[PDB]
Amino acid sequence: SDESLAEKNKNKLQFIEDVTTNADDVQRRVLEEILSRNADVEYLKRHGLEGRTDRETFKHIMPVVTYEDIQPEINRIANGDKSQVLCSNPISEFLTSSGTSGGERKLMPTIEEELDRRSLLYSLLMPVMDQFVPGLDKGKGMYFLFIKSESKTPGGLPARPVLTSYYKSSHFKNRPYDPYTNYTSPNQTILCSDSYQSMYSQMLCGLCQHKEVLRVGAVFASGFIRAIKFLEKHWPELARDIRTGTLSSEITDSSVREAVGEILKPDPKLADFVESECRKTSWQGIITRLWPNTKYVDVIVTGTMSQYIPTLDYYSNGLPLVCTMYASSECYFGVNLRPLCKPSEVSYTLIPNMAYFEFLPVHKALTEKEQQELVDLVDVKLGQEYELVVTTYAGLYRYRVGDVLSVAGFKNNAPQFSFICRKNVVLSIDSDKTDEVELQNAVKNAVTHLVPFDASLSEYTSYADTSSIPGHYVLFWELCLNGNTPIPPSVFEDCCLTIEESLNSVYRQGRVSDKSIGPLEIKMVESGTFDKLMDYAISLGASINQYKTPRCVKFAPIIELLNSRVVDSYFSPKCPKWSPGHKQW
Ligand SMILES: Nc1ncnc2c1ncn2[C@@H]1O[C@H](COP(=O)(O)O)[C@@H](O)[C@H]1O
């Protein structure tokens, strides 16, 4: 009903006003519920909280923690401990974060109830968008949504990414008919374990219903960029399926075949049109040509994903890029209340019902005083930067997420945050988040191949190259040759693979499982290249004694400068090794 939908939207927006006005009280209430329900859990009992639920005591008693501090408890639960270790409710599963510890995905505990809070955040997005872009209930959204690799812990609990867990839950699979969540992709195309068949069926379903499409997207920019690349490679096969009304024999999954069968009909004119647009040399504006009623591209382009803004603007011909929410495996955080703002102006308003949020000022061990005086959600100051600290319903207490956020403004009393970065992350193409330490150790393993040739790496840096789809990590190497035997290309290709083999499981899964990352490249640079970069820094006030070559570079003019001094480049000849789950298991 049009009246019931408008009433529902108005109530969700009034909920936002209520919780942003009474933000500190909602925060107080959330922490009280977490601490009363889990009063008798081992973690809080051993720290002496003694069933006290007040905020003042919690901040004085409980320590601020990293994943490594609580890994003993997490591993015990993963090995089968069903007692109340971190939570009074049973841990339903582990949500495997893209952030890693010891090169393995961090295991974030969750409880069945947490899906109600994830569904609450998702329920606020269309009521917010509807204010700015009306009429979205009269069409469909073409979203490319994917389930990723799953595994089981030794104790039998599922270990899977938060999005795979949500799509497989009844909150998404058995969701009620909402015209605002009417997607072109049937649930069976999303819930398909074969990534190729999932992408192929979703792209075909998207093309079959192209006139009904009012918005396009994916969770992340990289994933949507890959869907466009998939169409670049398979549009002749896909147009054939439209013309004949028969799905490709490569789609062997019977559940996908039945779901696609209820949409796919023979349509030679649509096939001719799809062929005519894709045949064109320039794909600038292919999204608006194939899906002409698209109002915006809905992908996250904040954080590392901002490197994709030029590619997305090319394929969309400058349609608005919309960043709707900020979330993690450990906790869903906030929504963007200005979805039509410019990507550089995006701020996320944290919803105080999700978790009890705390803020560590930034300008790593924390002093007793610093842990005690962590800033509450409503007390953060405009323009100041903070690390996000979270206390969740699923057994995390004063957990450092590692995200650095800046205060852009306030919605009533609730702060709005610009996303700065995930601390220490230097390279990323899709979900992979390679930190400076993983990279340094991967390069240290690779330079052992140069030792028999009496060669050494004088200096190196890196950047994430998005000139190709899927993107790849690029390493710039400057060698010091002290021997007489020239180094053959196979040795440098062995270095490329040795780096890849030492990178974390998310990087290696990206190369092996979903093909979201391309082969790593080592670009050799002329002698004196890194001394020329040092000359740029010395001119800008850097000392010779304090200068160290950065391990990673993002600023395009410096990447261009290094690329201009390249002699030869080498690529990894094969994928690194990868299998689902932790190597220990
Ligand atoms: N809207 C967003 N903009 C920028 N970074 C984001 C956004 N949403 C999630 N992230 C990052 O991804 C992390 C969660 O990764 P994961 O736990 O694998 O889902 C967050 O803590 C952020 O660092």
Contacts of 379 (CB under 8 A, 6+ apart): none
Query: Do 389 and 466 share a domain, yes or no?
Result: no
For residues 435 and 544, membership in a common domain is answered with yes
Clarify whether residues 12 and 54 are in a common domain: yes
**Domain membership flag for residue 503:** yes
| Rounded distance between C-alpha atoms, residue 531 and residue 537, angstroms | 10
User: Quick one: which of 199, 195, 225 has its CA closest to 471?
Assistant: 225
2-21 vs 23-37: helix crossing angle, rounded to 10: 90
Query: Do β-strands 332-335 and 325-327 pair in parallel, antiparallel, or remain unpaired?
Result: antiparallel
Q: Is 526 exposed, middle or buried (0-12, 13-18, 19+ CB in 10 A)?
A: exposed
Q: Which residues pair with 406 in a beta bridge?
A: 385, 418
Judge if 75 and 218 occupy the same domain: no
Task: Report which secondary-structure segment, H or E, holds 375.
Answer: strand 375-376
Count H helices and E strands in the chain, helices first.
Answer: 21, 22
* Residue 347 half-sphere exposure toward CB, CA atoms < 13 A: 14
Specify whether 283 is located in the same domain as 139: yes
Q: Within a domain: residue 316?
A: no
Q: Which atom of ligand 1 is nearest to the CA of 330?
A: 17
Clarify whether residues 215 and 153 are in a common domain: yes
| Atom of ligand 1 at shortest range from CA of 329 | 17
Is 345 inside a domain boundary? Answer: no
The rounded distance, in Å, linking the Cα atoms of 235 and 232 is 6
- The residue segments making up the domain with residue 539 are 425-571
Resolution expressed in Å: 1.9
CB 252 within 8 A of CB 332: no
Measure 335 CA to ligand 1 centroid, in angstroms.
Answer: 13
Residue whose C-alpha is closest to residue 30's, from 247, 251, 355, 282: 355
Best residue for ligand 1 mutational test, from 328, 392, 506 (most atoms within 8 Å of Cβ): 328
Handedness of CA 128, 129, 133, 135 (dihedral sign): negative
If asked whether residues 169 and 55 sit together in one domain, one would say no
Query: Of the residues 419, 420, 423, 514, which should be mutated to test ligand 1's pocket, given the most ligand atoms within 8 Å of the CB?
Result: 419
Q: Are 503 and 512 in contact (CB under 8 A)?
A: no
Whether residue 535 sits in one domain with residue 438 = yes
Q: Is the CB of 401 under 6 A from ligand 1?
A: yes
Cis peptide before 470 (omega within 30 of 0): yes
Which residue has its alpha carbon closest to ligand 1 atom 1? 326
> Which structure tokens are listed for 11?
């109530």
Q: What is the distance in A from the centroid of ligand 1 to the CA of 327?
A: 6
Q: Please check whether residues 439 and 403 belong to one and the same domain.
A: no
Q: How far is CA 277 from CA 25, 27, 405, 468, in A?
A: 55, 52, 42, 21
Which of 251, 275, 295 is at the close of a domain? 295
Cα–Cα distance for residue pair 575/509, rounded to 1 Å: 10
Do 337 and 128 contact (CB within 8 A), yes or no? yes
Experimental method: X-ray
Query: What is the sign of the dihedral through the CA atoms of 179, 184, 187 and 191?
Result: negative
Residues 6+ apart with CB under 8 A from 67: 74, 99, 101, 106, 399
206 belongs to a structural domain: yes
| Other beta carbons less than 10 A from residue 437's beta carbon | 11
Q: In a 3-state reduction of DSSP, which class is residue 169?
A: coil
The residue whose CA has the least distance to atom 20 of ligand 1 is 328
Per the domain annotation, does 342 fall within a domain?
no
CA distances from residue 241 to 188, 238, 274 in whole angstroms, order as listed: 19, 5, 11
Domain-embedded: residue 394: yes
Residue 327 lies in a domain: no
Q: If 0-12 CB within 10 Å is exposed, 13-18 middle and 19+ buried, where does residue 2 land? A: exposed
Cβ(495)–Cβ(455) below 8 Å: no
The DSSP result for 439-456, as a single string, is: HHHHHHHHGGGGGGGTEE
Quick check: 499 and 521 in contact, CB under 8 A?
A: no
Burial of 316 (0-12, 13-18, 19+ CB in 10 A): buried
Identify whether residues 446 and 547 lie together within a single domain: yes
Structure tokens at 242: 């439209």
Q: After which residues is the chain broken (C to N over 2.5 A)?
A: 363
The two beta strands, 93-101 and 104-110, are antiparallel
Domain count, the chain: 3
**One domain, residues 185 and 251:** yes
Return the number of other C-beta atoms located less than 10 Å from residue 402's C-beta: 19
- Per the CB < 8 A criterion, the answer to whether 500 and 520 are in contact is yes
Residue 146 lies in a domain: yes
327 lines ligand 1 (CB under 6 A): yes
> For the chain, how many residues are written?
585
Same-domain check for residues 394 and 431: no
Is the beta carbon of 333 within 6 A of some atom in ligand 1? Answer: no
351 lines ligand 1 (CB under 6 A): no
